[PDB]
Design a protein around this motif. Structure first.
Motif, mmCIF file in Angstrom:
data_model
loop_
_atom_site.group_PDB
_atom_site.id
_atom_site.type_symbol
_atom_site.label_atom_id
_atom_site.label_comp_id
_atom_site.label_asym_id
_atom_site.label_seq_id
_atom_site.Cartn_x
_atom_site.Cartn_y
_atom_site.Cartn_z
ATOM 1 N N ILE A 3 -1.366 8.364 -4.552
ATOM 2 C CA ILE A 3 -2.209 9.299 -3.984
ATOM 3 C C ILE A 3 -1.687 10.693 -3.909
ATOM 4 O O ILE A 3 -2.195 11.680 -4.306
ATOM 5 N N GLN B 194 0.819 -1.128 0.034
ATOM 6 C CA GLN B 194 0.052 -0.008 -0.056
ATOM 7 C C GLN B 194 0.812 1.172 0.036
ATOM 8 O O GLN B 194 0.132 2.431 -0.090
ATOM 9 N N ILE C 238 1.220 17.032 -4.528
ATOM 10 C CA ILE C 238 2.258 17.639 -3.485
ATOM 11 C C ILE C 238 3.694 17.411 -3.985
ATOM 12 O O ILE C 238 4.471 18.516 -3.949
ATOM 13 N N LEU D 228 -2.540 14.190 -5.652
ATOM 14 C CA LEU D 228 -2.684 15.542 -4.841
ATOM 15 C C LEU D 228 -1.663 16.456 -5.356
ATOM 16 O O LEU D 228 -1.884 17.744 -4.921
ATOM 17 N N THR E 10 -0.163 4.744 -1.690
ATOM 18 C CA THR E 10 -0.017 6.113 -0.954
ATOM 19 C C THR E 10 0.737 7.150 -1.673
ATOM 20 O O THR E 10 0.256 8.293 -1.965
#
Lengths: 53, 57
Positions: free
Chosen positions: B51, B44, B57, B55, B48
């Motif tokens: 993700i 996972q 970021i 985002l 992440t």
């Protein structure tokens, strides 16, 4: 963390007053603040019901 | 009445022993084919990280 309202997203152990002073040109460190602040203002969790399904 | 019965009687023990050994062999083969399967699933952490890329970021 959600009973004190503490921000879900993780937060690094940093002292930006030192980082600002440590570096030479602002742009790199300035950008660093945006990323971590954006990271700290989000909840990194999923709906495990659908995942399990 | 006499001969064939006597020879069948003589046969019985060896056949019984061999069939017992055969059954034990079947059980042993059944046991030997059992292995615990361990499956690998996508970590996972990569999810992440993806993700975060979404985002921006």
């Amino acid at each position: 963390r959600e009973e004190e309202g503490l921000p879900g997203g993780p937060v690094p152990r940093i002292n930006w007053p030192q980082e600002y002073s440590s570096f030479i040109d602002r742009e790199p460190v300035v950008a660093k603040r945006i990323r971590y602040d954006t990271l700290a203002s989000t909840t990194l969790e999923r709906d495990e019901k659908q995942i399990e399904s | 009445d006499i001969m064939v019965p006597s020879f069948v009687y003589n046969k019985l023990p060896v056949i019984h022993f061999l069939q017992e050994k055969r059954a034990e062999q079947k059980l042993r083969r059944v046991l030997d084919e059992t292995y615990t399967e361990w499956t690998e699933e996508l970590d996972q952490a990569h999810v992440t990280d993806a993700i975060t890329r979404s985002l921006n970021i």
